[PDB]
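User: Predict the complex with pyridoxal-5'-phosphate.
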Amino acid sequence: TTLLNPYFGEFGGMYVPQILMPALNQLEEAFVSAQKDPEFQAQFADLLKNYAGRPTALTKCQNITAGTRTTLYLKREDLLHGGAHKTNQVLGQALLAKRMGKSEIIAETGAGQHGVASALASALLGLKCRIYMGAKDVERQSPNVFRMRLMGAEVIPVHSGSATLKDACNEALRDWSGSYETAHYMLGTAAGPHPYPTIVREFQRMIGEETKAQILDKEGRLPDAVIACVGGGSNAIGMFADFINDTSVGLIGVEPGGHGIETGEHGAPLKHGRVGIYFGMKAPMMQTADGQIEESYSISAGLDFPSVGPQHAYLNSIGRADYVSITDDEALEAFKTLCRHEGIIPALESSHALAHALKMMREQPEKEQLLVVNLSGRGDKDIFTVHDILKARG
Amino acid sequence: TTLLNPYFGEFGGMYVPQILMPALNQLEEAFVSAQKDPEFQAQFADLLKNYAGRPTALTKCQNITAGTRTTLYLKREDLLHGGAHKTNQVLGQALLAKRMGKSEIIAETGAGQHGVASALASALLGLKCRIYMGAKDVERQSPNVFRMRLMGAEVIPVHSGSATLKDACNEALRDWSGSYETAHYMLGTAAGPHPYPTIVREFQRMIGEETKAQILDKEGRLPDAVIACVGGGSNAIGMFADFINDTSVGLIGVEPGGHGIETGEHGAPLKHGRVGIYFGMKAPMMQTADGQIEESYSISAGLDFPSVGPQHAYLNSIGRADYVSITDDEALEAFKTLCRHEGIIPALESSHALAHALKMMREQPEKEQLLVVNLSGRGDKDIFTVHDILKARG
Amino acid sequence: MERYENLFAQLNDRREGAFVPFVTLGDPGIEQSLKIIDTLIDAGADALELGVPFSDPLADGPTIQNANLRAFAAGVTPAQCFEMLALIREKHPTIPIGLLMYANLVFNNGIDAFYARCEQVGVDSVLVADVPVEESAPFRQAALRHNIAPIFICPPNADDDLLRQVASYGRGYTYLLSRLHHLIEKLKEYHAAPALQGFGISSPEQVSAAVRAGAAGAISGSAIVKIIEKNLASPKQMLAELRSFVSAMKAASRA
Amino acid sequence: MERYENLFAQLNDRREGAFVPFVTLGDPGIEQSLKIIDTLIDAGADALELGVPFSDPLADGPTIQNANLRAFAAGVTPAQCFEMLALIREKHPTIPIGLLMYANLVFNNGIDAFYARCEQVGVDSVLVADVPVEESAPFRQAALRHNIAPIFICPPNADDDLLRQVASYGRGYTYLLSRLHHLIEKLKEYHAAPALQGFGISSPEQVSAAVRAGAAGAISGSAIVKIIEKNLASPKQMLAELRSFVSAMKAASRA
Ligand SMILES: O=P(O)(O)OC[C@@H](O)[C@@H](O)c1c[nH]c2ccccc12
Ligand SMILES: O=P(O)(O)OC[C@@H](O)[C@@H](O)c1c[nH]c2ccccc12
Ligand SMILES: *Cc1c(COP(=O)(O)O)cnc(C)c1O
Ligand SMILES: *Cc1c(COP(=O)(O)O)cnc(C)c1O
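Assistant: Here is the predicted structure with pyridoxal-5'-phosphate placed in the model:
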């Protein structure tokens, strides 16, 4: 029994060991309660505005669309404190943890971006944050590891198993299985077992709500489409949610195509994987023929995830949202284009969404269309990645 | 003859070779005209808001002041597009350049931060930006050099003279002496010859105006003091300007003390240098006994400047603003304190202002005082600097 | 199911508890794993709990995670595991054989087809570690249609509602997480499948305590696998050490 | 001032233009610089324009910037420059000697004191490169009280107002930036100090053209300094090359 439906059509659910069900049920109830509590809402709003910097700007990019009938706006989550949309929901989850009487946060991170977000909200709200990280990742992520420790989070190197993210997640959940009365597991995307896909969406939906008010103010109508990159699905569902019942508005999710779908080195399970059960949910995933979870790939670490949130699988299945893929090369070109023409250095994750809008524009230059791309983050973090690739390509 | 007074008491003026006076006079007139033009103002406001992200938040930092009677707010210029307050005024200057019918921008940069700011405004507004940089700096500034070129600016390595900043400035002014009809020299701080100290201040004064409205909204009164770091003086004069006639409000400028004033390795000319004439202005500067300009120093490149804006020298002389210094070690401790207690990684420049507020608080913990620190920028850029120092100190 | 029912009736007639080793199929190799399993049986295992290596075993402890890696290094796949299962049943016709699975390997080619294959090779029960009772309907239905006992974990934080569901839906045995007298009493009150205590059982005294608490037996996994882990270079010593440990744990279960 | 007035009266009586070399005091060393200056005089310089190395010479061209660096490498200071100036006047009593200064070295120990020191050593004029007429009041007043000619640059972008001020405030010579017939005519109309064309003068034909345009002479700096720059390893060759170049440029100025 749950208060909310754990499924979006056949996708979602709570595929966790029995011992974690009470933690999930407790979280769902605290979240339902929090959503009806004006005080919680006022506190979350105050932090979003006065600490994180919301509302974020909606920037019209005229230079990039010159000569075409496309009008493009970028929702500026790259201007949010921390440099990415992740900040929104970790602040909400940290408030839920406190509502449940918890003073500790458990997270795990690969690239280190969720780790940084978890650590900053925890520093701000007086929570002892411990982040599990595969030893292999700790080694390859010095900058973010340092940021996490500067902010007081305990970064726990995991050497068990293969010493990668799956090993960190494992240890994190085990920890949580024994400490959930005093610790909250802060999941970093709109995936995993219910209630997380729902919570993350609701804690990121201000992206879409603001975009709606801003576009109505500036253009006097809704967008023909909102476009967002999709790793686990949080920034995209955050942008999409408020427009779901506005059926004239297209919702386009962009998965990473990596070196190309045909090469198998990509992170596009929604359109090119197969339904499976893992990470506590039933969802499309990249898997071998006999059911092992495949390794995903993208030039962008933030989109290097082998599955996708269930609500996206569902919106896709009923045809309400369409999902496409963008390769490393297309993302890199979009990255360079935005720097040069708008003076904005976008995250490589976000460059996948921008790349797809650039393609919609360039393929049909005389098509009149009002598009909004969710610029999920800034790309200062990607400067060396891009530099070395370009240097390598002479 | 000029439209505005070139001096602030005995400080300021236009100490440039005769050939540059027409360029200065032209700029002063365009600026006076622009200030009376509602269209210019609307355009500058639109860019500040929809592209740069203004207004920036005013964040109350409760954790850091716990146990004392100090209430501290941080004006969040670190949330401005680009990560620092520099963005405000380069957007205004780029609009002035266009008002004068110019399509090119000339800048020079050492650390590379002004370079990045100039390049992004130029990319946005369709201006061909060329940035002179001492060859020694180009070598030691790969990240920012790459950012500048990603944004389309031509970064010109200077090998003339000693191949440092002074050599880049020299070449930049020479260039400007011959190209001013079509090129605008974008000065990056509130210093240099008139009209720049005035223009930069007016194009950064929204920092102080917003702070005033935000503090009156949240506290119902003005701050007991606003505190800001001082390199050339732009973010501090931007914070101070709107409060100058509010005589109850203290204005405290913080110069870098480097390894300590007594060691001579610092960047605190205002309080420890001597009046001189250089960079087109009469102002306090670090100089040898026989008049050569001394080399300044700070762990923070952005505050490593051997002089200070004339309006600061003036406010100091009449006692309206007080200036102090903060050492590298005090700035580093403030940097760590903010990361750990508020989850905000501040620029090392800004950490000097924060360090001084922390000292006002800690030295007199029972003194009731409402302080605002101008958090001029974010410190992602300083992570390796801080890391290596800490690693070096075991 | 029949094999578990038969085993527990016999053990009960002997006032004896069951000792059930857990090992990962394929660890450290297919041949060595089959020899390991035959040694556990000869040494006294009453039943077996066998893991099929999965890439993302969210609930496997450190020792078990390392067993999965060794099996993957040997190239073990679910198909090879089923071939091993067939051969193990072909050698031991009465010992109950239970699988410890992760949902995706059961769901992958169709839930019903998975339980059909278990029936075909002679497996008796399946515990899907990441399927709580709330999501168990398709799994337990498919298991029953193929005469496979669906196994549920009764954790320490179980409430009355969970006890009743577990008693009602499970067959073969109830997996009683040690991390209990009360949990055991209610399970019997609700007529649950005999309970086997699992988690951290590594010494003979824990096996006698489990039986004394009312459990029908005990499962030991990490302690067995560590023996494999420590003797990878001496296969002979590995089996000898395994025989000694299992024999000791099994004696602890006798009246 | 008297020396310039006397020089220009004599040159005019000979229908001749002035050739004025510019070098940086101390480049490449104090001794070599004094020998360089004596060679320029012996070879025909009518006057000298001498730079005092400054750390931040915003208006010095590339060749000159390198001369400052060589002088600084030799440890040249303003005090050593004044000692050199005294000695140069002590050897050549009539040649006009003009300094090219940056504001801070004049302002450093007091504007009046700086012009007093110039008078003491026998300097005749001072051009402060970064002081436009608008900021010149204290400098030109101090110069006149000490009988030093205040020199102003008349740039290419000069308007009528600038011409009148320059004609009125300057003494000795007017520094006419070549980057002119009209600028020269107005300067004479306003009774400005005789004009010397400066910037890029490197060949004899430019010296004759300057005089033909109405200028009273020409200044050559980079061309002279490059000769120093290219022969740093052969002091003898340096002086020989300097003698040849100055002698040629000076001949170009004769009727
Ligand atoms: O290793 P232990 O502490 O002896 O406990 C057995 C347990 O590991 C084994 O039965 C097992 C392996 N994987 C699992 C996944 C979920 C529940 C139980 C298991
Ligand atoms: O080097 P040129 O092109 O021959 O021009 C002489 C000029 O350099 C010299 O007079 C000079 C040296 N420094 C200056 C500063 C300002 C004006 C003029 C100067
Ligand atoms: C983490 C990240 C993403 C990917 O995660 P979603 O949950 O799919 O949003 C996208 N953009 C940025 C900038 C990120 O940091
Ligand atoms: C450039 C910089 C400064 C120093 O310059 P001011 O003109 O004195 O403001 C201060 N803070 C940051 C973050 C800077 O980038």
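Chain B has two domains: 8-52+86-204, 53-85+205-390.
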